[PDB]
């Protein structure tokens, strides 16, 4: 399968999450995503075919993970934006106030701005700290998906948000939205990963 940020993948033939970013760990191919999407050794599938397994994860506390892929997978320096693509050019972290977008299997490509940093989310499983907040809307299933600027700087992966009864927070004003992502930099260093860029 072609590994592109934002696309859907399943975990152990059950949950569905979104791909974060194509990365390499030496000769090993992989993609980063959210830790709450799967447990170590869980099997990831795309298009009905097995593409790899969860190599490591931290959740709660943090919300990160990476999936080790088979050599047959095709790593790409891109994130899905509708039928088009946003090229991943680096991982420079944007400051509060910057515009940012994310790609996910549920809400597609959504944009907004970064409103706060170091935010704590109190999830059912426990607290997750150090998350960055944005007013771009999101929905269930977008988890693990790419957060990136229009200039191609990868910011992190989708962790959670204050979704409403319809499963997303797109139905309420931006001023009332809290969409949270796990910063990419600590994920890359935690697992010794290098971003695939173009």
Look up residue 186 and give its two tokens.
């600590």
Resolution of the solved structure (Å): 1.2
Q: Is 185 helix (H, G, I), strand (E, B) or coil?
A: helix
- The reply to whether 179 belongs to the active site is no
CA distance 23 to 31: 5
The DSSP line for 30-66 is: EEEE-GGG--TTPEEEETTEEEEEEEEEE-SBS-EEE
Look up residue 179 and give its two tokens.
């969409």
DSSP one-letter code for 189? H
Which residues are CB-contacts of 6 (< 8 A; sequence separation ≥ 6)? 18, 19, 79, 80, 81, 102, 103, 104, 105, 109, 145, 146
Which residues are CB-contacts of 80 (< 8 A; sequence separation ≥ 6)? 4, 5, 6, 7, 86, 103, 109
- The reply to whether 142 belongs to the active site is no
Active-site residue, from 10, 18, 22, 63? 63
Q: In what order do the strands lie in the sheet with 84-87?
A: 2-5, 74-81, 84-87
How many Cα atoms sit within 13 Å of 130 on the Cβ side?
14
CA distance 4 to 9: 11
Q: What is the 3-state secondary structure (H, E, C) of 70-105?
A: CCCCEEEEEEEECCEEEECCECCCCCCCCEEEEEEC
Active-site residue, from 10, 18, 91, 143? 143
CA distance 192 to 128: 22
Cβ neighbour number for residue 53 with a 10 Å cutoff? 18
Residues listed for the chain: 198
- The reply to whether 143 belongs to the active site is yes
Decide if 151 contacts 84 (C-beta within 8 A).
Answer: no
Q: Residue 85 CA to chain centroid, in angstroms? A: 16
DSSP-based helix, strand, coil % in the chain, nearest 5: 5, 55, 40
What is the per-residue burial (b if ≥16 Cβ within 10 Å, else e) of 17-46? bbbbbbbeeeebbbbbbbbbbbeeebbbbb
Which technique was the structure solved with, according to the deposited record? X-ray
Tokens 């988890």, residue? 143
Q: Is the dihedral of CA 180, 67, 53, 61 positive or negative?
A: negative
Q: Which domains does the chain have, with CATH numbers?
A: 3-76+184-196 (2.40.10.10), 77-183 (2.40.10.10)
Q: Is 186 helix (H, G, I), strand (E, B) or coil?
A: helix
Active-site residue, from 36, 102, 146, 179? 36
CA distance 150 to 73: 26
For 191, list phi and psi in degrees, rounded to 5.
-110, 10
Q: What region does 20 belong to: left with phi over 0, alpha with psi -120 to 50, or beta?
A: alpha
């Amino acid at each position: 399968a072609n590994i592109v940020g934002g696309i859907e993948y399943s975990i152990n033939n059950a949950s569905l999450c979104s791909v974060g970013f194509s990365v390499t760990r030496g000769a090993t191919k992989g993609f980063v995503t959210a830790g709450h999407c799967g447990t170590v050794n869980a099997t990831a599938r795309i298009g009905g075919a097995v593409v790899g397994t969860f190599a490591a994860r931290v959740f709660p506390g943090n919300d990160r993970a990476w999936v080790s892929l088979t050599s047959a997978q095709t790593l790409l320096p891109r994130v899905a934006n509708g039928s088009s693509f946003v090229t991943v050019r680096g991982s420079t972290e944007a400051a509060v106030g910057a515009a940012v977008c994310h790609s996910g299997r549920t809400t597609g490509y959504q944009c907004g701005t970064i409103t706060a940093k170091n935010v704590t989310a109190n999830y059912a499983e426990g607290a997750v700290r150090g998350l960055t907040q944005s007013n771009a809307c999101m929905g269930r299933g977008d988890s693990g998906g790419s957060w990136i600027t229009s200039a191609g700087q990868a910011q992190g992966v989708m962790s959670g948000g204050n979704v409403q009864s319809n499963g997303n927070n797109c139905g309420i004003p931006a001023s009332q939205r809290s969409s949270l992502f796990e910063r990419l930099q600590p994920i890359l260093s935690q697992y010794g990963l290098s971003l695939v860029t173009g």
